[PDB]
Design an enzyme around this catalytic site. Structure first.
Site, PDB file in Angstrom:
ATOM      1  N   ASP A  35      13.673  -7.850 -23.636  1.00  0.00           N
ATOM      2  CA  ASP A  35      13.036  -7.444 -22.379  1.00  0.00           C
ATOM      3  C   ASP A  35      13.796  -7.982 -21.185  1.00  0.00           C
ATOM      4  O   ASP A  35      13.720  -9.173 -20.874  1.00  0.00           O
ATOM      5  CB  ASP A  35      11.592  -7.958 -22.331  1.00  0.00           C
ATOM      6  CG  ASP A  35      10.840  -7.512 -21.079  1.00  0.00           C
ATOM      7  OD1 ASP A  35      11.072  -6.389 -20.593  1.00  0.00           O
ATOM      8  OD2 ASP A  35      10.001  -8.290 -20.579  1.00  0.00           O
ATOM      9  N   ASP A 218      15.083  -2.270 -16.851  1.00  0.00           N
ATOM     10  CA  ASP A 218      14.159  -2.921 -17.777  1.00  0.00           C
ATOM     11  C   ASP A 218      14.115  -2.322 -19.197  1.00  0.00           C
ATOM     12  O   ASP A 218      13.462  -1.311 -19.442  1.00  0.00           O
ATOM     13  CB  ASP A 218      12.751  -2.913 -17.173  1.00  0.00           C
ATOM     14  CG  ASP A 218      11.760  -3.695 -18.001  1.00  0.00           C
ATOM     15  OD1 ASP A 218      12.191  -4.400 -18.935  1.00  0.00           O
ATOM     16  OD2 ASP A 218      10.550  -3.600 -17.718  1.00  0.00           O
TER      17      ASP A 218
HETATM   18  C1  LIG Z   1       6.054 -12.335 -15.208  1.00  0.00           C
HETATM   19  C2  LIG Z   1       6.909 -11.552 -14.222  1.00  0.00           C
HETATM   20  C3  LIG Z   1       7.743 -10.442 -14.941  1.00  0.00           C
HETATM   21  C4  LIG Z   1       6.862  -9.281 -15.427  1.00  0.00           C
HETATM   22  N1  LIG Z   1       7.718  -8.143 -15.716  1.00  0.00           N
HETATM   23  C5  LIG Z   1       7.171  -6.943 -15.948  1.00  0.00           C
HETATM   24  O1  LIG Z   1       5.966  -6.730 -15.945  1.00  0.00           O
HETATM   25  C6  LIG Z   1       8.120  -5.807 -16.237  1.00  0.00           C
HETATM   26  C7  LIG Z   1       8.253  -4.992 -14.941  1.00  0.00           C
HETATM   27  C8  LIG Z   1       7.553  -4.946 -17.381  1.00  0.00           C
HETATM   28  C9  LIG Z   1       7.947  -5.669 -18.676  1.00  0.00           C
HETATM   29  O2  LIG Z   1       9.316  -5.364 -18.973  1.00  0.00           O
HETATM   30  C10 LIG Z   1       7.027  -5.334 -19.874  1.00  0.00           C
HETATM   31  C11 LIG Z   1       7.548  -6.114 -21.122  1.00  0.00           C
HETATM   32  S1  LIG Z   1       6.723  -5.514 -22.642  1.00  0.00           S
HETATM   33  C12 LIG Z   1       5.010  -6.171 -22.454  1.00  0.00           C
HETATM   34  C13 LIG Z   1       4.301  -5.461 -23.586  1.00  0.00           C
HETATM   35  C14 LIG Z   1       3.635  -4.327 -23.360  1.00  0.00           C
HETATM   36  C15 LIG Z   1       3.033  -3.527 -24.482  1.00  0.00           C
HETATM   37  S2  LIG Z   1       3.752  -1.772 -24.308  1.00  0.00           S
HETATM   38  C16 LIG Z   1       5.570  -2.147 -24.291  1.00  0.00           C
HETATM   39  C17 LIG Z   1       6.101  -2.474 -25.709  1.00  0.00           C
HETATM   40  C18 LIG Z   1       6.125  -1.181 -26.582  1.00  0.00           C
HETATM   41  C19 LIG Z   1       6.945  -0.072 -25.867  1.00  0.00           C
HETATM   42  N2  LIG Z   1       6.339   0.231 -24.545  1.00  0.00           N
HETATM   43  C20 LIG Z   1       6.413  -0.975 -23.707  1.00  0.00           C
HETATM   44  C21 LIG Z   1       6.202  -0.725 -22.252  1.00  0.00           C
HETATM   45  O3  LIG Z   1       6.329   0.397 -21.770  1.00  0.00           O
HETATM   46  N3  LIG Z   1       5.879  -1.834 -21.557  1.00  0.00           N
HETATM   47  C22 LIG Z   1       5.746  -1.797 -20.115  1.00  0.00           C
HETATM   48  C23 LIG Z   1       4.482  -1.027 -19.676  1.00  0.00           C
HETATM   49  C24 LIG Z   1       5.806  -3.238 -19.721  1.00  0.00           C
HETATM   50  O4  LIG Z   1       4.920  -3.737 -19.065  1.00  0.00           O
HETATM   51  N4  LIG Z   1       6.903  -3.920 -20.156  1.00  0.00           N
END
Ligand SMILES: CCCCNC(=O)[C@H](C)C[C@H](O)[C@@H]1CSC/C=C/CS[C@H]2CCCN[C@H]2C(=O)N[C@@H](C)C(=O)N1
Length: 375
Positions: A35, A218
């Site tokens: 990630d 991402d």
């Molecule tokens: C703490 C500060 C940093 C936070 N960073 C973020 O939120 C990023 C912008 C997003 C992340 O890259 C974050 C990491 S995966 C968390 C698990 C979700 C189950 S769904 C995930 C896993 C399965 C495939 N689809 C994914 C998806 O599509 N996730 C988006 C929806 C998301 O959320 N990704």
């Protein structure tokens, strides 16, 4: 020595891509989601309906508790757990062992996915967005400090496994030239989009709209996610180009899946999307072109049909542009932290449209690119 890292990733766009890691002594094997949109290394450390295995701190002689809690919210999903450190290795990565921060996940909501086959997450971005704060050194920062591994990695995600080359670039994973865009700021892998075209037509928006309030690369997000105003302009354009056929409006919301008779998908009626990214020299940019085979994600038929069904993999965002896995698929992407830049090249594992090809092309001239950054 990168040949041993080729193909070290499994999984899909919609399920996440994961790499194998071991933590503790003796080594415990876990599949870890890769990630680039976060900066915490965290693993399931307690039973869960969706986990077939997890991290057991009690079984590791090298485990050290940091006696501090931690919480991490994502666009979707969230967990909380306990901070500690332990020895970590990547079997199909460089030949090293490092002491890394690890969040042992004790409680979570909508984080683990049923049958995804991964039990944790590896945040590859910078300390600035680490929870609880930027003093918790991210895994890759630890790897680079404790070993001789160069400060970069690259990702080749292949749609319908992949490779994470740690510490370098493997030239057999891409064709043509690498084009580089500056990392605007080291927190997310933030970049600046300076122009958007659909089937060769400029969206003609103020370029700040494209990066409102940021644009990031991402691997942990499935979709291309666009700010509201850009998302609406894009969907309108894509509808008009494909107005030949009729689609449920729930399709354009990424909810309902459309289907076609096996091998009869009308790719030609869907437009290519070109994102222009700020380049490395004054007034210069370059573009990546996305085929419909990328933003129409293939999904299992909800029936007993041998038909090809797809979901619309572009969605609206309220937190900026996200260039997710469906965009990264078919490019080789270099996260060159040492030189504060991200490189793109056509991937060796790209999809084959009949008359069109995903591309990375430059140079282009673009005046005033700095004004595209949002403040
Ligand atoms: C703490 C500060 C940093 C936070 N960073 C973020 O939120 C990023 C912008 C997003 C992340 O890259 C974050 C990491 S995966 C968390 C698990 C979700 C189950 S769904 C995930 C896993 C399965 C495939 N689809 C994914 C998806 O599509 N996730 C988006 C929806 C998301 O959320 N990704």
């Amino acid at each position: 020595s990168f040949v041993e890292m080729v193909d070290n990733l499994r999984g899909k766009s919609g399920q996440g891509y994961y790499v194998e890691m071991t933590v503790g002594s003796p080594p415990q094997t876990l599949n870890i989601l890769v990630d680039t949109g976060s900066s915490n290394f965290a693993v399931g450390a307690a039973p869960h309906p969706f986990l077939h295995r997890y991290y057991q701190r009690q079984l590791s002689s090298t485990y050290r508790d940091l006696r501090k809690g931690v919480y991490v919210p994502y666009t979707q999903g969230k967990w909380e757990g306990e901070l500690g450190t332990d020895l970590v290795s990547i079997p199909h990565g460089p030949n090293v062992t490092v002491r890394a921060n690890i969040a042992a996940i004790t409680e979570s909501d909508k984080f683990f996915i049923n049958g995804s086959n991964w039990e944790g997450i590896l945040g590859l971005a910078y300390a600035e967005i680490a929870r609880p704060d930027d003093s918790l050194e991210p895994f890759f920062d630890s790897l680079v400090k404790q070993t001789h591994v160069p400060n970069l990695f690259s990702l080749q995600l292949c749609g319908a496994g992949g490779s994470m080359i740690i510490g370098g670039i493997d030239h057999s994973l891409y064709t043509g030239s690498l084009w580089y865009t500056p990392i605007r700021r080291e927190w997310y892998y933030e970049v600046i989009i300076v122009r958007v075209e659909i089937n060769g037509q400029d969206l003609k928006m103020d370029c700040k709209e494209y990066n409102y309030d940021k644009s990031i690369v991402d691997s942990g997000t499935t979709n291309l996610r666009l700010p509201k105003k850009v998302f609406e302009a894009a969907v309108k354009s894509i509808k008009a180009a494909s107005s030949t056929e009729k689609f449920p409006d729930g399709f354009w919301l990424g909810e309902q899946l459309v289907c076609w008779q096996a091998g009869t998908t009308p790719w030609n009626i869907f437009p290519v999307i070109s994102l222009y990214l700020m380049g490395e020299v004054t007034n210069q940019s370059f573009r990546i072109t996305i085929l419909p085979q990328q933003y129409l994600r293939p999904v299992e038929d909800v029936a007993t049909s041998q038909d090809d069904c797809y979901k619309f993999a572009i969605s609206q965002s309220s937190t900026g542009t996200v260039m997710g896995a469906v965009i990264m698929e078919g490019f080789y992407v270099v996260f060159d932290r040492a030189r504060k830049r991200i490189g793109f090249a056509v991937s060796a594992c790209h999809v084959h449209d009949e008359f069109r090809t995903a591309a990375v092309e430059g140079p282009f001239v673009t005046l005033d690119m700095e004004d595209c950054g949002y403040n």
